[PDB]
Structure formats: C-alpha cells, structure tokens
Design a protein around this nucleic acid. Structure first.
Ligand code: MG
Ligand code: MG
Ligand code: MG
Ligand code: MG
Ligand code: MG
Ligand code: MG
Ligand code: MG
Ligand code: MG
Ligand code: MG
Ligand code: MG
Ligand code: MG
Ligand code: MG
Lengths: 394, 107, 131, 61
RNA sequence: UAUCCGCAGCAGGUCUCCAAGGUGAACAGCCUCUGGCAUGUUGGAACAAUGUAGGUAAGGGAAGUCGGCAAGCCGGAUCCG
RNA sequence: UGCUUCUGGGUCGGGGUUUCGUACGUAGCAGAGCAGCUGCUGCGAUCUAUUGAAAGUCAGCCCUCGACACAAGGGUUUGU
C-alpha cells in the first residue's frame, strides 16, 4: 500500500558516489567558455584557506529594510601568493573528446615544483628534467622547440598553462608545491601562445586574475568525518526510545518484491572529504601582503578608510591552526569548503551575472581582528596595553 | 663519548593528554621510557623506583605536568646481554620548572 | 514596502505566553501560526512580529473558550538583528488583535520588538517603549 | 557602527560580539559575553568582583 | 565469586557465631585501621559506525505515544500551617 | 606530509594569545568578640597591601632563531 503521509526525500541523489575524493586539491571540471573578442587572460587560480573574520559595511540596495544601514558579514580569508608558470599544454578537439596534443616545459624549474615529481624526495637523486633542460640551450633543441610551438599554434584549439604555487612563502609544513593547468581565455591561439610563452618561467599575482568586487566559484574537498551512520550522513529521523536493536537507523530498507535494495536507500559510510564546488562567492577585498620600503615594514592590510589604524589582517595570536598571513590574500563572502590550511581552487564565473546583488559595490568600514583563540576583546596589542596598563611582568 | 649523563624536563601533560583516568600513570611511564630511548640511542632503558614513586605520587589520574629527570647512558655490565649500553633514568626533585634548559651534567 | 527578514523563531504550538495589554486576558495559548506551509512531524512555530491564532487560558470569562488572532510582541529566544546584535527579552509576550491588525486593547505594558513595531503600525502607536 | 560598553564589566563591545538583553521595565542592558551574562542574571554586584572596571575604580587600582 | 549441588575453577543456590574509627537517627550510604586481595578463564595498539551503562542541553513544555512508557520534579531536620 | 644550501626538523626554554579569578608567605591600631598581664600579649572566621596575582596553555594554537642532541642510515622489489 501507499505511504499515507507524503514527505520529501532525505538528501540529494545528485551527489551519489559519496566516497572519499581521489584528489586532494579540487580539479576544475569545466573552464569558462572562450570568445576571441576579449583580450587574453587567465581564468583560475589557487589559494589556501586561513580562517574566517567579521566585516562591517554599509548596504546599498534601494527598497530594502537595511538600505543605507550597516550590517556584519562573515568572510573567509584565502592566503594567496603569486604562482609561477612552468609549462604550456595544447589540446586538440576530436570526435572522441579533447586530447593533449603537446606539452612544453620551462628551462628552469624550482625544487618546489621538482618535489611534486617524487614520492620520496629525501632518497631520490633529483634527476627530474635534467636531460630535458638541455633542449633549451642547444640550437637543435631550440629549433625543435619552436617547431613544437608552431605545431601547437596551427593545430591546437584551447591552450592551458602550467603553474605551481610557492610553498616557501607560507607557514605550512609541506614544501611540495601544487601544480595546476589553467585555461588561457581570450584572443586567437597565436596570441594565447605568445602570451603564455612570453611570461613562461615567471610569476603571476592574484590581482591580474581576479578583480575586486567580483563573484567567483570555489572548488575544493570538504572536511573529512570518517565512517558515519545514516542519521548523520543522510539526516534521517531517529527512531523512538523503545526500539530494541538500535535507534540511529533507518527501519525500512526496501519493499519485498523488488528483491534487492536500491541505490537510493540511505546507508552508512564515509561522510565528508568529498569534492565540491560552490558558485557565486563574492570578493570583498584583494589585500596585498606585508612589504618593505625605507627599512619600514608596511603591513596595514586590514586598514580601511573609515578606520585608519595600522592593524594587519592577522588577529592577535595569529589564525588558529594556520599561522600568519604575510603575503597577498583575498576576502570572500561567507564560508567555503574545506578545513584550515586546505588548498582551494578559485575560478571565474561561468554564467553571465547581471543582477543587483551581483553588481553591488563593496566598501568596507571595519575588519574585526580580535583573537579567535577564545573570546577576544581587543583589536590590537597597543589597544590592549593602553586599556590594561602596566602588568607585573613588565 | 658513549658513557654520558644529561638532564631534561619532560612535559607529561603534553605527552599523555587525552587518555583515560585509569591509564594515565602507566602511559606516563611508557612515554618516559619512549622519550629516554629516543634521546639516548639505545633500546634498553631502566627506571629507578624513586622516579616510579615520583610519577605515582599524586595518584593514577592526576600526574605531575612536568618532571625533571637525569638520563645516564652507561655500558651494560652483564656481558652476555645482546645490548651493549643501557640508560638509567633518575628523578631530580626541583622547586620551579622555570628557565630550566637541558644541562650537560658532567661526571 | 520592505519585508521582515528571517529570525530565530522559538515559540512552537502549545506555548503559553503573557498578554501585554488591558483587554483582560492574562495568558495566550498558541494553537497555530499563520503562514506556515508545514513539513512532516514539524511543529509550526512563531517568531516575534508573527500573527498567530491563540486562546485565553486565564482571564475574564467573556473572552475565553474561543479563538483570537494575536501578534507576538517579545520572545525569550535570542534572535539576530542584521546589525549584528543578538537580542532577547525577559518573557514571551503577545497582544490580541483582529484579522486586519487593529489592536483590541489600548495600551501595552513593557517594550515592543522593533520588527513587530515596524510590521504592525497600530501596535507601534500604543507601544510605549521599543526594542 | 558605534561601540558600546558592557553593562556589567564595563569593557568595550565591538559590533560582532556580545548579546543584548531587554527587561520588562525597559532598561536594556548589553553584555560582552556569557560570563558577564551569568553574573548579571545571578545578581552579583560588579563592585565586588576583582576583574571588572567598577571594582578597580572603586579600589583605585 | 575455586575443595559443596547445578555436566565446569558456572554472576545461581546452600544453616550459624564474633564485629573497630569518622560522618550520621542508624547494623543506611561514603572514607579509613586490624585482617585479606590482585580486578575475577588473557594481554597490547587505537578511540569509525551500530550498541550496552551513564550524563548534559538553548526556546517551547506531552504538541510524542495505545497509554507521561522512560526519565525528570520532590526528598533530611526545625518553625508555622 | 617531513627527513644537512650551517641547512633541517625534534625536545626544552622564552615571548604572543587565552582561561579562571587575585596564589603561598609576610605585614596590618583591619576584624564580631574572648582570655591573661598592667596599654601590651595570646585565640579568632573574614578583610586589606604585596597581587589583573597565581596556575594552565597543543598534545591537532601562533612566533622564536636561546640551549641540547640528532639528522648523510636500514630493508624488499622492479627492464622497453
Ligand atoms: Mg501520496
Ligand atoms: Mg523491547
Ligand atoms: Mg574561537
Ligand atoms: Mg507524525
Ligand atoms: Mg576492569
Ligand atoms: Mg588480571
Ligand atoms: Mg573465578
Ligand atoms: Mg531543553
Ligand atoms: Mg531552559
Ligand atoms: Mg496527544
Ligand atoms: Mg500524534
Ligand atoms: Mg515511571
């Protein structure tokens, strides 16, 4: 007989293979589509999650209850040093899909990227690309190289540049860099190839990829949570207290006559550490890193034009479990996937965005930098000491 | 070079944080032995009864947060034993664990 | 014009709240909350500024044993104003109105939440204090 | 944004933190955190608790 | 809780004597001395799900359920009543 | 994920942060009062000063560039 009282499904079947990700960093499943009209540029970049923070701004949307009021909005900090480019890959489109035509690497590759090529760097003799790098200083090697470039120019359709992160500019424990392919979008294949090969082997910052007050997509792996039951992986209702053989279960696993149990019935297993992507995450700020000039270290990242203090983005005691954000960073709205210290892919929006909340201009008024390692009361150490006075230890 | 005595302070709070009440002192001894065999390169570590009493002084679930110990690596007297060197671990009663570096105490 | 945002609602069906007016009632017993679509095994609950159906459990006889429309004035559950503050009152209290927002009494004892005062202009006029 | 003072400890409350508590007789208070909240609800005099500002100012510390 | 009966070194059963200190109305419960013992037919490493035995939960307060089942509230003494 | 660019991680120590709430001792003509000796000496819960003090703080917090030792090792396989 039928289910007497209807009720919607628990969970979504669109994320069904609810298994551990085969990858640690998110892979861009689809890059933004190309058009030759726009100038050439990049479409994705890679950062690291640091922590979350308060923000105070003034809303500007007519007809709202909070028009020209001031609201607080949680934000996510993604520390993001400039990448460095090490290679170019061309793709040719086929009736069977899209296959790699040819790959060209740079003359000099840092040990940061070399570490990615070994699963035991301590024991290795570090021979990656040692015989390849001689193709660059040889006349025959370089003429074969430009033959490769011309072949890519006249046979390939989409161009992806290889870039890796700089792990020595981060407080993280690992020294093995992250390597990625980023699609070059813009003009024709010749222009894209010239652009990629004229800044091959050098650095690319974040402000050249993403602009302030823009809505992007975030890709990454969620937090792992181990083996979990149906009542927490699928959020089914708990059974009453009187149940004999356990109450954190789902009672009916299926009807009789379909003599199997379907793919759609909630079962216990791995929760979290899945690969996810979230769309429409808006950028409030692109802050530069600590820099040096005249022997004085300028650091006032979190300084707004309504505050005029010299506090940096780092709260007192640093970001918990992560460290200190000394180089460039971006500030997205809300929460992103993944835990602290997690690598995190950022990409341009796919769909065109013409809507009011997509075209609001963001002007910040206050950035809270109280200690997150407990209930913090003071924004800066100077403020703390001025309020408290001299201590015994002083 | 081989026969040598040094002294350290051990953060038992850190090394046994998170364990059950009835297993704290035994794991305190296990962690002390592991620390001794990691510092002095020998698998044979023996602990004085005075140090055992010091670790067990406050009971089974309340253990001192830090202990000052002396590690003495010395050659094994019983020649037929496979191990050439052993490490005696002794208790050092202190008043404050402040600014106490590891000290190369000499003979 | 501007609509009310979502708030941390904390008054399910069956909640008994105080009556902050001079109509003669002393308790409201919430029987249902207007505007609720519902879900399986999901108690319809009301936040501040919401209009509910209630009944009087203690009060003068002529206004007992029947259903009255009411508006929730204060709640003990702390709710988040979009300014970033979390506000909660000492008691859960409401007033009895008609179907179109006119209040049956003439004065309100105690403060009135800003959301309710904005949504119901007749409640705000008789509200002595606010927020 | 304006910065307001904790009704119990006298500390300085920033926009994101704290809670605000209105009584039946009006007289809205604001509290920095749940420690101050619980002390206020338990009806303790701030002049007697060492870590607040009223105590420090009345003892000239 | 191993010399008896129960197929067994079986959480069952099997008639009596003696009986310290403190708290406390008390041979109640809790801590100790005389006397006894080695955790009850094994140990080591971790701390997933589901369990068994305990706890705590904002706002509401039986709306749950056949049914307040279960848990929770109350608790001693003195003075009123 | 890490495992010699005098570099590295590791331990300990030191700062930052943060939790609770003002330590022991000493001094007080502060202290309901009581005892003794002719104002002093004793008992006395509590209070005041030293004292936002003392204690804890990554084991899954943040920086150290202080001290100490250690790290160029071991084993099993893989051929176009
Ligand atoms: Mg149906
Ligand atoms: Mg049963
Ligand atoms: Mg925190
Ligand atoms: Mg139902
Ligand atoms: Mg046992
Ligand atoms: Mg045993
Ligand atoms: Mg036995
Ligand atoms: Mg509750
Ligand atoms: Mg409650
Ligand atoms: Mg019923
Ligand atoms: Mg029912
Ligand atoms: Mg019962």
């Amino acid at each position: 007989s039928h289910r007497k009282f209807s009720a919607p499904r628990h969970g979504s079947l669109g994320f069904l293979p609810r298994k551990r990700s085969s990858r640690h960093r998110g892979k861009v499943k689809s890059f933004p589509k190309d058009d030759p009209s726009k100038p050439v540029h990049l479409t994705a970049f890679l950062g690291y999650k640091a922590g979350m923070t308060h923000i105070v701004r003034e809303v500007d949307r007519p007809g709202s209850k909070v028009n020209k009021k001031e609201v607080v909005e949680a934000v996510t900090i993604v520390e993001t040093p400039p990448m460095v480019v090490v290679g170019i890959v061309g793709y040719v489109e086929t009736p069977r899909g899209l296959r790699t035509f040819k790959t060209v690497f740079a003359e000099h590759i840092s040990d940061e990227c070399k570490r990615r090529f070994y699963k035991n760097w301590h024991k290795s003799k570090k021979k990656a690309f040692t015989k390849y790098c001689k193709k660059w200083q040889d006349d025959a090697g370089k003429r074969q190289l430009d033959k490769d470039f011309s072949s890519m120019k006249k046979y390939c359709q989409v161009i992806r540049v290889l870039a890796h992160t700089q792990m020595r500019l981060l407080p993280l424990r690992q020294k093995k860099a992250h390597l990625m392919e980023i699609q070059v979008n813009g003009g024709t294949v010749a222009e894209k190839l010239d652009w990629a090969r004229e800044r091959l082997e050098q650095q690319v910052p974040v402000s050249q990829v993403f602009g302030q007050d823009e809505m992007i997509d975030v890709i990454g792996v969620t937090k792992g949570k181990g083996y979990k039951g149906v009542t927490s992986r699928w959020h089914t209702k708990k059974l009453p207290r009187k149940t004999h053989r356990g109450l954190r279960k789902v009672a009916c696993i299926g009807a009789w006559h379909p003599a199997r149990v379907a793919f759609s019935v909630a079962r216990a297993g791995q929760k979290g550490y899945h690969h996810r992507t979230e769309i429409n995450k808006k950028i409030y700020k692109i802050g530069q890193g600590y820099l040096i000039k005249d022997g004085k270290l300028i650091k006032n990242n979190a300084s707004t034009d309504y505050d005029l203090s010299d506090k940096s983005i780092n709260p007192l005691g640093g970001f918990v479990h992560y460290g200190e954000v000394t180089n460039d960073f971006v500030m997205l709205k809300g929460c992103v996937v993944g835990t602290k210290k997690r690598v995190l892919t950022l990409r341009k929006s796919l769909l065109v965005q013409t809507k009011r909340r997509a075209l609001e201009k963001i002007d910040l008024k206050f950035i809270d930098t109280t200690s997150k390692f407990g209930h913090g009361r003071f924004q800066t150490v100077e403020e703390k000491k001025a309020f408290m006075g001299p201590l015994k230890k002083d | 070079n081989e026969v040598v005595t040094r002294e350290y302070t051990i953060n038992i709070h850190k090394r046994i944080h998170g364990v059950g009440f009835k297993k704290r002192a035994p794991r305190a001894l296990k962690e002390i032995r592991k620390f001794a065999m990691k510092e002095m390169g020998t698998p044979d570590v023996r602990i004085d009864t005075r140090l055992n009493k010091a670790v067990w002084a406050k009971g089974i679930r309340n253990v001192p947060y830090r202990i000052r110990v002396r590690l003495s690596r010395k050659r094994n007297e019983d020649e037929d034993s496979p191990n050439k060197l052993y490490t005696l671990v002794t208790y050092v009663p202190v008043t404050t664990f402040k600014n106490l570096q590891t000290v190369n105490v000499d003979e | 014009s501007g609509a009310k945002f979502r708030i941390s609602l904390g008054l399910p069906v069956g909640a008994v709240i105080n009556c902050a007016d001079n109509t003669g009632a002393k308790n409201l017993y919430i029987i249902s909350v207007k505007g609720i679509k519902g879900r399986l095994n999901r108690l319809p609950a009301a936040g501040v500024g919401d209009m509910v159906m209630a009944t009087v459990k203690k009060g003068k006889p002529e206004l007992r044993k029947k259903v009255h429309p009411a508006v929730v004035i204060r709640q003990r559950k702390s709710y988040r104003r979009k300014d970033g503050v979390f506000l909660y009152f000492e008691d859960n209290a409401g007033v009895i109105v008609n179907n179109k927002g006119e209040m049956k009494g003439s004065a309100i004892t105690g403060p009135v939440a800003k959301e309710c005062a904005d949504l119901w202009p007749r409640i705000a006029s008789n509200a002595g204090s606010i927020a | 944004m304006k910065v307001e003072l904790c009704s119990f400890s006298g500390y300085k409350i920033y926009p994101g933190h704290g809670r605000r508590y209105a009584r039946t007789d009006g007289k809205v208070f604001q509290f920095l955190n749940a420690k101050c909240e619980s002390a206020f609800l338990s009806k303790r005099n701030p002049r007697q608790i060492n870590w607040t500002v009223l105590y420090r100012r009345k003892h000239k510390k």
